[PDB]
Write a structure and sequence with these properties.
Chain lengths: 297, 297
C-alpha cells in the first residue's frame, strides 16, 4: 500500500570495466568508476545472451526487486546498464556463494561462523518479511559471502512482493527448487514468509552438513510423498538436539507452527554466544577502492 | 512530508529491573524481560527527578526522535515506561561514551579503531541526514560504545526533524555547546546538516587527540571571535595532513563548501583500508541474554 520511492540508477557503459569472468547467463568481476567521483567500486556484472523480450522482462523484474531493498544482509544492486542486453550491476561478493564456500573450507569452519551465518540470514529474511517480500528461492547457493564474517541473501529471480492485502502468493507454472520447498508450495503452489522459513531450515541443514545435497539421490518426483509420510532431513552429526530441533520446527506441516524469522534471530543469537555448547566440531593501484557498502550516492 | 509510522512501545514497570546506577538526571543499568518472551535484554534506563511538566515535555520529545530512527549506528530506543516520572529505556552501551573511552584507553587505541569510528559516526550522521534530522549536539560525549568496534550516535535532546520544505532550523534560546558549533549557528542560531558536519569535525579532533578539550582554557564567550579571525583547532600530533585536511574542510565558513557526510564515509573508509598510512601512533545466569540489536519485536 505504501509508495516505493526506491531509486533506479542507470549506469553508462563507459563507467565500468569487466576484469574477468565469474561464470558462464554470464557474470563478470569488474570495477565501477563513477565519472568524477574519485572512487573505484568492485562489482559483479550480470549480462544476459541472445536478446529475448522474455529474458529482458525477467532481469528487469529482478532489478526492480533488488533496487527496492536496503539491508546489511541483502545484496545491494548498484544499477543497470541499458546496452543491447540489459546488465545488472551488483556489489562484488569476493568469496562467492556460501554453499561452495562451506564445501571448499570444511576444515576451517568453526561453530562461531556457522551460527553467525544463521543469524545473518535470518536478519536478511526478517527484513524481507518486513518489506512484505517473499523470496521463494532461499538456499545456500543463494547466499553470498562478502567476508567470512558477513554474508548477504541474493537471487531475487523468484521473489514476489505481496499486495497490500495479499496474504500469500499463488504461483502458476515454472520450475522451483523442489528440495527446498515447503509442502504447501509443492502441493498447492502457495508461497508465504512461512514457506521461506521452511527453506531457511533446509539452508541451515546445508550449512550444518558442510554442503551436503538434501535428499541426495532421491527423485524430486518422490519428495512430495516422503514429506507427507512425515520423513525429514536427518540430524547433522555436528548438531546438538537444540539446533536440529529448530530445523525440524521449520519443517512443520502447519505453516503457522513454524518459527518466525524474528524468532530465529533470537534463538541463533543466543547460541552464537557460546557456540561450542550448540555445535560440536573437531578442532573448533587500489588507492581509491571503496566497497559499495560505503558508497551511498 | 511522509507519515512517520514508527511504533512507540509502552513498557510495564514490572517487566524490567534496575541493576545499578550509571550516573546521577539519573541513568541505571538493568535488564528488560518482556513477559513470556524468554529473553533478557540489557538496557540503560533514564528516569527523570521531581516531576516538572517542562521536564516531562523534553524527554517525550527525545523519545519521539529516538523511536523514529533505525540504523546500526544510531542508538536504539526500546520503549518508555509511564511511571510518575517517564523513563526512557534504551539499549545498554556497556562501554559508555566515546570521549571517556578514548581517555581511559589511549595506550591501547590503534589507528584502525580511530578511523573505523570516524566511518561509523559518518554513517550514523548520513542516515540522520536522510531522515531530514539535525542532531545539533554531535560530540564525542554523545557517541556510545557497544563494543570497541561498534559505536552509535546518541543524545537526541537537541535534535530537530525538519519540515518537508524547511531547509534549515532557527533556534531561539537555550544553551547549546559552543565549542562544537558551526559559526553560522553561534552568530545566527541557524542549524543544518552542514552545521552537524562542523561538529563532526570537532568530534573527530576530540578522538584524534585522545580526548582533549577543544579550545581548552578559552572562554566560550571569545569563541565566536577566534573563529572569525580564521583560527581553528590545531593539527593533532598523530594526524597526517590527509586527515587534518578533512577536519579543516568541516570548519569552512561556507557551509556548502564543507564535506557531506556521504563523502566523509568514503574518505575515511579509504583511509581505514591502510590505517598506518593516515594516522601515526607509537605502538600501533545469562543464558537467555539477547542484545537489543537482535531483538526485533
Ligand atoms: N554479486 C556477486 N558477486 C560474486 N559472485 C556472484 C555474485 N552474484 C552472483 N555470483 C555468482 O555468479 C554465478 C552465477 O550466479 P547467478 O546469477 O545466481 O546464477 P546461478 O543461480 O549461480 N546459476 P543459474 O541460475 O543457472 O544462472 C555463481 O557463481 C554466483 O554465485
Ligand atoms: N544507552 C546507554 N548505555 C550506557 N550508558 C549510557 C547510555 N546512555 C547514556 N549513558 C551514560 O549515562 C550518563 C548520562 O548520559 P546522558 O543522558 O547523555 O546525560 P549527559 O549528557 O551524560 N550529562 P547531562 O546532559 O548533564 O545529563 C553518561 O555517562 C552517559 O554516557
Amino acid at each position: 500500500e505504501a509508495p516505493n520511492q526506491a531509486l533506479l540508477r542507470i549506469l553508462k557503459e563507459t563507467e565500468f570495466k569487466k576484469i574477468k569472468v565469474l561464470s558462464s547467463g554470464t557474470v563478470y568481476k569488474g570495477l565501477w568508476i563513477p565519472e568524477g567521483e574519485k572512487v573505484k567500486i568492485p562489482v559483479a556484472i550480470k549480462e544476459l545472451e541472445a536478446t529475448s523480450p522474455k529474458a529482458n522482462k525477467e532481469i528487469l523484474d529482478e532489478a526492480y526487486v533488488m533496487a527496492s531493498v536496503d539491508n546489511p544482509h541483502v545484496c545491494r544492486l548498484l544499477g543497470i546498464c541499458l546496452t543491447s542486453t540489459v546488465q545488472l550491476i551488483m556489489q562484488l561478493m569476493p568469496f562467492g556463494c556460501l554453499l561452495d564456500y562451506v564445501r571448499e573450507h570444511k576444515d576451517n569452519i568453526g561453530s562461531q561462523y556457522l551460527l553467525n551465518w544463521c543469524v545473518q540470514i535470518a536478519k536478511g529474511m526478517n527484513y524481507l518479511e518486513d518489506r512484505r517480500l517473499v523470496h521463494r528461492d532461499l538456499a545456500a547457493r543463494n547466499v553470498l559471502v562478502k567476508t567470512p564474517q558477513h554474508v548477504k541473501i541474493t537471487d531475487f529471480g523468484l521473489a514476489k512482493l505481496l499486495g497490500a492485502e495479499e496474504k500469500e502468493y499463488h504461483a502458476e507454472g515454472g520450475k522451483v527448487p523442489i528440495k527446498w520447498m515447503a509442502l504447501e508450495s509443492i502441493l498447492h503452489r502457495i508461497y508465504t514468509h512461512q514457506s521461506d522459513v521452511w527453506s531457511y531450515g533446509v539452508t541451515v541443514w546445508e550449512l550444518m552438513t558442510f554442503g551436503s545435497k538434501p535428499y541426495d539421490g532421491i527423485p524430486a518426483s518422490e519428495i512430495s510423498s516422503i514429506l507427507e509420510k512425515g520423513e525429514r532431513l536427518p540430524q547433522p552429526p555436528i548438531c546438538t538436539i537444540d539446533v536440529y530441533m529448530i530445523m525440524v520446527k521449520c519443517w512443520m506441516i502447519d505453516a503457522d507452527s513454524r518459527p518466525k524469522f524474528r524468532e530465529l534471530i533470537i534463538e541463533f543469537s543466543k547460541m552464537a554466544r557460546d557456540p561450542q555448547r550448540y555445535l560440536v566440531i573437531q578442532g573448533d593501484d587500489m588507492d581509491d577502492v571503496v566497497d559499495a557498502d560505503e558508497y551511498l550516492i
